[PDB]
Every structure is written in C-alpha cells, then in structure tokens.
Design a protein around this nucleic acid. Structure first.
Lengths: 271, 93, 46, 9
RNA sequence: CGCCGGAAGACCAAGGGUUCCUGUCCAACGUUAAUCGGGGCAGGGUGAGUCGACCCCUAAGGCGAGGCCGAAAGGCGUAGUCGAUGGGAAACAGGUUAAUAUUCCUGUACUUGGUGUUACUGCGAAGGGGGGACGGAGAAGGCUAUGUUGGCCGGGCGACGGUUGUCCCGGUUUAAGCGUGUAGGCUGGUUUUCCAGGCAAAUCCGGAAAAUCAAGGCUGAGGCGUGAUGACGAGGCACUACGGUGCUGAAGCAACAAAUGCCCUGCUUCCAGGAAAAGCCUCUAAGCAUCAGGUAACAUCAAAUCGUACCCCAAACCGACACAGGUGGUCAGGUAGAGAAUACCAAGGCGCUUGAGAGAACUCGGGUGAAGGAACUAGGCAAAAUGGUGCCGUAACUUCGGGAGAAGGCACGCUGAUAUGUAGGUGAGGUCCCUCGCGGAUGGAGCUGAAAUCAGUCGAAGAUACCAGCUGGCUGCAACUGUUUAUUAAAAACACAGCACUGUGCAAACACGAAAGUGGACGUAUACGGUGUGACGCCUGCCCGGUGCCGGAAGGUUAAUUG
RNA sequence: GAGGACCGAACCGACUAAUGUUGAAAAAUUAGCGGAUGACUUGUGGCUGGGGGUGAAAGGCCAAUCAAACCGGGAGAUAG
C-alpha cells in the first residue's frame, strides 16, 4: 500500500515510500546474522572492476534456506522481516523441531501458515517441492538450476516462472525475461510467487537517495574527454561519433553473449 | 635468581645527588645507579645481602643521555638506569 | 595552508623502515646500493 | 610564485 | 594602566627529544642595547599491581605451511599469523620538590592469580548456547556537575557628604570504596514430561504437552549513611637567608535554579534495517572419577618489562625564520542574552624582541560632513542602510507544501498599584493512612518567578551599546539540495531523481589480471552493466539514400588446409 | 516530530572588495558571504603506482611540478 509523500521541501515532493505495515519491526534474529563488509566495487588487485559502486549504509547478510533439505517436517511462519540485500521479503519460519531458517515469502503467505516442503507435500503456496511433481502452468519461483544447488532463478521480487512443458527428464521453464530455458525436473522449486509486486513503484525522489544504496553518480562520456572516453570534445557538447562503451565495445546493437556450452538449454531468445 | 655472580654487577655505582640526600634523611630511600637491564626483584636482592639491610620497596626509572655536539659532528652520551631502594626501620649505610 | 609533510612515526616505519625493504626482492636491492655507497644510516628509525 | 598565463597579442 | 577570558586559560594524543629546573657566561644565535632567553657551559630532574603501552581478542587489510598460477623475478590464496582508530580485570582524596605526583609519603581502598587452612560439592574444550553486540532522528521526565540567594562564622565602621545596619568583605570545601536499591526501564515466574533441532553429547538453548502461582527477577542514575574523632580551611601564634618554615585554627548548613553531563546500550518512532572475536555466564563430550578440580571464608606471596621531564592551536609540531598560516579530542565561572553569538569580568595568561620624537604630502585603516541623492561608473563596485521580540496584517502566482519574515505598521525604559512578588514552579513543618519504604495523601509556610493592565515619570533619541534581513517588479538560464579547474574562471558547466534504448539466464554481461583468482554478488531480469536525456506539465513529427548495427541464409567472392 | 527543511556559532567552503605583490604568508589577512541532521565534516589506519591510478569530469589531482610524477640508467640522445 504505497503512500505518495506530501511536497514538504524539495527532494521530498517526488518521493514515494512503499510502506509494509505487516512487517515485524524490531531487532533481527541474532544468531544467523553475519558480517557483510562493503567491497567498494574493487577486487583483490584494488582496481575498480565495476564503477558506480561505493559508500552507503552498512548491511548485514542473512542466510536463507534455498535447498529446503528438511523434507517432511511441517513448518509455520513466525514473522516477516526486511532484507536490505534483496527486493524480496524474507520470513522466519518455525520448524516443528525448533530449528529456524529464513525463506523467501510467497504472496499468499501470512502469519501462522502451515507451509511444508517435501515430495509428498500438498500443492499450496509457500511449499518447496521438486518440479517433477509440479502441474503444468502453475506459478513457480526459486527454481534450482542444478539438483539441490539452491535456487538461483526468480530470486527477485515480483518474479514468477511458468512451466509450459514437461517432456523428457527436463522440464521447460518460462522465464520472466521471456527467454525460454530447459531445466531438469529433479531440481527443487517453490510454488506460487513472491509477494513484493509493489517494489517497482518506488521512485527514490532525490539526488541523495541513491547514496545509501551504494550507487555513485554517473558521468556521461560525451561530457568527458577523448583521452578518457571515446566520446568527448567538439567544443560545446556535440557528439558525431557512433555510441560505444568506454572500452570501445559497440553500445546498442551488439550481442556480447558467447557461452556455447549452455546453448542446448536455450529453447528460444528473449522477446 | 641467585646466581650470586649476576647480582654483583647490578650495583655498578652509587649515584649521589642533592635530591637523593633528602630522600635518605626523610623518605629513607637510598638512590644508586643500576644495570641497564635487570628488574625490580634483582635490585632488591642486591641490598638484602651485600648491603645487609631489609628492603621495603624498589622503584626504577631510566634517564636518557642528553645529546652533545661540537661543530657539524654530534656526540650523544649514554643512557643509565636510576633506582630507588626504599629501606625499612633497619636502615644503616 | 596545510603542508604536504604531516609526520607520523607509525606510518614512517611501515613505509620506509628496514622491515619494508625485506618485504620484497626489489627492496633488498635498495639496501645493497646504500652499503656499497657507504652510509651512516642504512635506513631510519630511532 | 612565477605564475603562468599567456601573452596572446 | 591595557588585552584575551568557548582563550591568546588548562589538559591529553600526534609530533618534537632535554627546549624542564638551577648556577653562571654574552663571542656567535635574538631583525635593537641586553645583566635576559627556548643561546654557551656545568650540575640536577622523568619514582606506577590498579594512567598508558606491552598483554588477550578482532575489523578493513598485510603476510602466508602446503596449494594454484606465471619466461625468471613473481602473482593469488587455505589452514594460520599479524594488524586499533575497537572490545577485554582493578586507586581515590590530602601533602610534599627549585623541576616529577592518582607514581613517593599520609589516610582509606580494590582486582586478578600462585600457595596454605577449613567448609560444601561433579569437575572438565580449540566444541554448543547465552552474553558481549552496537542505527538515525525525536520526545520528555528523573538527577548531578555548577551557580545565585539566605543563614552561620571570622573580619571591617570607612582618606569626601552618609554608613552599628534591611551594611560591607571572605569562607561555607570533602573523593574512591562500602552499606542502602529509590526516580525509572525491561520481562509473567516455578515445576514435571516428551522431541526428526543446535555436526559429537547434553541437565543448556529451542520446540511440544501439562501442573501451579501471581509478583519472580534483571538493569539502574542519584540521594541518604559510612568512609570522616579526620582532612582541607579564611585568619592567627611564631621563628625568619625576607625567597618562607612549624604550630594552632572558627563556621563548614538550607532553599532555589540547573545543563550539551548522567539514568540512556533506555523510551518513542522511522527505513536507509544498523561490525568482529575473546574475556564473562552455562552445556556436556574425549576423561578423572576417595583424587585432581569446582564454589565460598580466612591467611600469605607475586603483579614483571617499557613510557612518565617540558611544548600542545604553539617561538619548541608542521611552514628554509623566535613566520599575522595549518594542527584532533577533553575542561565550560559571573552579568546581560535565545545561545558555545557578543560586550564587560573571575581563575589564569599576556602588553606580541627595536624605540624616542616631529604632527608635511601621499598611502593604508576609520569618524563626520552643509546642498543635491547615482548626476559617478563597463556595472549601485565600495560604503551607506535595513537589523530584535510580541502583535496587527500581507498580492500576483502555484506542483496548494509555498510565495512569506512578502510588503506595510504599532508596542518596547524606569517606578508604584493591581499582588508590600501576581499566574506558575519548587516544596518544609503539622495531620492521617501504611503489606511500614528512599512511601502516599492531606497540608500549605518558605524560596523562586515571568507576562499583562492602569497610573505616574525622564531623555532629541528606551530592540538606546555590542549583537543584529535592504525591499519590490519584468525576464534569460538551470528543476531544486550539492559538486567543479587546491594556487586568476562557482558558473548556464557537472551531478540529479525520473524517462528511454541496449546488453546480460549466472560459472551472466562487463572489468582487473599473460594466468590463477577476485569484483559484479555471497545479487538473479521489479536484478545488473553501458549509453543518452535530465524534476514536473504539454508533448516528442518525417526520412534507412549515405554511415553504423541487427536479423537472414541460397547464390557471388574468398584464407590456412588437401596436392 | 517529518525534512539532501528555515535563520544562525563551532566546523566546513572560498562569491565580492580593499590591503598585500623582493608580503607577516611561494595564495594570506580584513569587512561582508554559502552550507551548517547531511550527497555533512573530521580523527586514526589501510587500498588503487606512471600510458597507470583516481575523478558528482576541471584532461583536474597523484607530496609547492602532471596533455603523462619523481629517481637512476641508456646518455656526452639528437639539434641543418
């Protein structure tokens, strides 16, 4: 339930906060917390391998149970909690043995829900069961790319992946990008979709809003110099040159992809 | 500990001064130079036998040698360790 | 105006101390030249 | 101080 | 006499390295003379179980057994190790020196270990859990540092009209520790049984069933006692190298105000969701199991090594100088005031290492000026002016927050009365209730104290000093807050949220690196990179010939290769 | 009690003008100014090393020097 900010002073007028009242305010479940120091975008060489990354508020990473290895055991939600690292909300479910692990939150999730991973598990949202048991066309997220590896697919908020086919050991998936890709049926996946569909609505609303996100200001290359960027000079803005990356790779209209090994999995290019 | 021979070199020379004389007539703490190393305990044992008097408490400090110079050439002196051996009611010489 | 020289003994020994010369093969060669040249101070410290 | 500038006549 | 007094006072770290103290000296050092000095020479000075370092632990990182990789040098990195700007046990008052004091002395203490005696008893990791362990902003409340007034004690009857009184001056200071556990804050406690969890196990944590009871516990300033029969103490008695040393030494209370300090690592609230490990509290395992060990009372021993002087916004550090520059943290008095602004003062430190004159131009820093009031000038440049609080009132326009303190005015001192000090705030005695405490109600003295009305009064001027917005209109540009050529350009330039295009399915694209390995990211197309444009509103037309690129695979053309 | 909110010290920044120009100072002082709860400032300690680094982009900055730092070497380079 987004609420547009009132125009009290500049840098506040355009802001649109995305409040989430059902979230449980308070200190995070401490033992699973661990350090996540900012890299600054630099590597071991100390070179800036990736620009426009630095600064921002400190963040603490939290482990999440992608594998859902505890099959059979019933689980119950305790409370939703904010995750700085990801657009998707995370929830601290309570296993019957008393063990606790974070999990991505399905749109149908509420406090006290009886979600349960397992091969024999009933088909309700929030469950994580292998796709071989999954009916065609159901909304699916957190799909493993490899058997038991975790679930790299559809981790982002509002994402969902339909399963349009099941022929062979593989099961075809419909990615949010619209790109088609085969995946083995043995891989685990979560039913339904993550509920943070309101995430796109945020618009920051000020120049300093990106500063805590670790984002750094972008300098266009036409404003630069020929020695620093291929674009530049010309005395008074200008342009002329065909657009390019600073390292000279052609921007706009050049597929940089070159994997070959994974082309077998690519049923179709994204549209 | 003793090892009598190590103890003997600790008491290389007494260090008389106008301030030290006041320490003996009032605080009853004899003042003398000691070895560059050693410890509070070894200095105490040196007084227990050779000075044949009981020690109350030992205190130590290190005065840095003042730099000297003559022309472009310079000549730093040498460091030495002062010590404060407080004496009990049994003090003599 | 602030001077370029802003002394700190802790930074000095870490950057220009005898230990830094031994940190790499290139640094050990630096000491070798000072010795053949003859010097009162192979490095600097206290 | 020496300065710089240019003598463009 | 004059200056600072949120410092030009005081302290620590950084850094400097005897500049500290004393005697003596004046060649050179000091922008002058110099008996003086941060100068020459010599002597003296730095006292630690509990201040800090060392030590234990860890961040960003560095190094790195093997290993991976690279012509060689070398690069990366595991287990490890190092790394404070962090965390981790414990000393406070008085006195003394020419210079050092939480170090020595005096008084009262405290922590962690070794050993011994006695009592009780399941003790034991590199492991599990708990704890340590943390954000921004805001709101007050309860207190202390500290201040004012009164009381008390000691001293003073005034160089000139008054001053034995409602007068003047000074003091009224006391810590750690220990006992007490309040103002508050947090949480329902105890017991029994069971478990797919916490790599092994578990009495601990967690989960599940019951029973019982309602206050069980933790945290916590400060106050009150003790510490304190003292110590300090204005001022005297006494010797006196006139630089001081011994002895004695009165009162040592109350009320109010009160913080930026404390309770507070709290509470409330908001996204931007807020280090790491050890010490510490517990749990067992491999084990010992009458032991060793564990806990408690007493006694004893040990707490080493190193720093400790001086300078600390400067004459000593950094600036070639005894240089109008630069340098982090801590201590925060009186009056006025919103205030750490500013003026005058306390404590305290200084009059800044050339002076004495003369009173020309001209120059620099200021004051005032009759008449005019931008006529000056590239240009209202510079000066001048506006300036506070309370109240009245305030247009076009707008994204309905603005514009706006728009503009434009009134009131402002002192004294009396309302009320010999009011509204309020603080709060004693008396009275009563108490599972009886640092209680509550009742009660209202005393103290403190604005703001207002009326009347009177003085000056040319009462926000009188310092302090302290000039305002309005049209328009260009950029949305705005910011950032930018350190050392001639602060802008229309850059950034900007937003919009769009394009690349990317994860061992991603991209980037560093001959590689290995990292970053992206411990992210997953609502994500990330690149490019363009630059809030918002109205929108964003046409052209693919040329150039670039995508898509397409027959044909034309064509390399190494085959010969 | 919200704000890259308002006035305004510390703090940070350096728009105007005078003085200074072998200055007290190889960029300061004086009288005004901007920001001052944040895209803030700063202490301490690390990281990126020369055709490279870093840059809210001035080709600025990298020890008073930067359209390619400094040191040593080739080197007594070449110079019609």
């Amino acid at each position: 339930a987004v609420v547009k900010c009132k125009p009290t002073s500049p840098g506040r007028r355009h802001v649109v906060k995305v409040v989430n009242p059902e979230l449980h305010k308070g200190k995070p479940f401490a033992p699973l917390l661990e350090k996540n120091s900012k890299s600054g975008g630099r590597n071991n060489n100390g070179r800036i391998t990736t620009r426009h990354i630095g600064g921002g508020h400190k963040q603490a990473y939290r482990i999440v149970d992608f594998k859902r290895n505890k099959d059979g055991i019933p689980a119950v939600v305790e409370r939703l909690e904010y995750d700085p690292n990801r657009s998707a909300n995370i929830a601290l479910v309570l296993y019957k043995d008393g063990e606790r692990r974070y999990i991505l939150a399905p749109k149908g999730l509420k406090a006290g829900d009886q979600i349960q991973s397992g091969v024999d598990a009933a088909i309700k949202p929030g469950n994580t069961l292998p796709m071989r048991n999954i009916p065609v066309g159901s909304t699916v997220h957190n799909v493993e790319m490899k058997p038991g590896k975790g679930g790299q697919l559809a981790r982002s908020a509002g994402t969902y992946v339909q399963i349009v086919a099941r022929d062979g050991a593989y099961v075809t998936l419909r990615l949010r990008s619209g790109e088609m890709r085969k995946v083995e049926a043995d891989c685990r996946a979560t039913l339904g979709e993550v509920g943070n569909a309101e995430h796109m609505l945020r618009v920051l609303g000020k120049a300093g809003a990106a500063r805590w996100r670790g984002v750094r200001p972008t300098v266009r290359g036409t404003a630069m110099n020929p020695v620093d960027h291929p674009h530049g000079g010309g005395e008074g803005r200008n342009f002329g040159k065909h657009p390019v990356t600073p390292w000279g790779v052609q921007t706009k209209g050049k597929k940089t992809r070159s994997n070959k090994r994974t082309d077998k999995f690519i049923v179709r290019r994204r549209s | 500990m003793i090892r009598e021979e190590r103890l003997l070199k600790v008491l290389r020379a007494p260090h008389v001064s106008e301030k030290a004389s006041t320490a003996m007539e009032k605080s009853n703490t004899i003042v003398l130079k000691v070895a560059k190393d050693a410890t509070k305990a070894e200095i105490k044992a040196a007084v227990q036998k050779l000075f044949e008097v009981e020690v109350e408490v030992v205190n130590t400090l290190v005065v840095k040698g003042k730099v000297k110079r003559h022309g472009q050439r310079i000549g730093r002196r040498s460091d030495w360790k002062k010590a404060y051996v407080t004496l009990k009611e049994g003090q003599n010489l | 105006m602030k001077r370029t020289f802003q002394p700190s003994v802790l930074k000095r020994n870490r950057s220009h101390g005898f230990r830094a010369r031994m940190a790499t093969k290139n640094g050990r060669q630096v000491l070798a030249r000072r010795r053949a040249k003859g010097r009162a101070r192979l490095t600097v410290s206290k | 101080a020496v300065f710089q500038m240019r003598n463009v006549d």
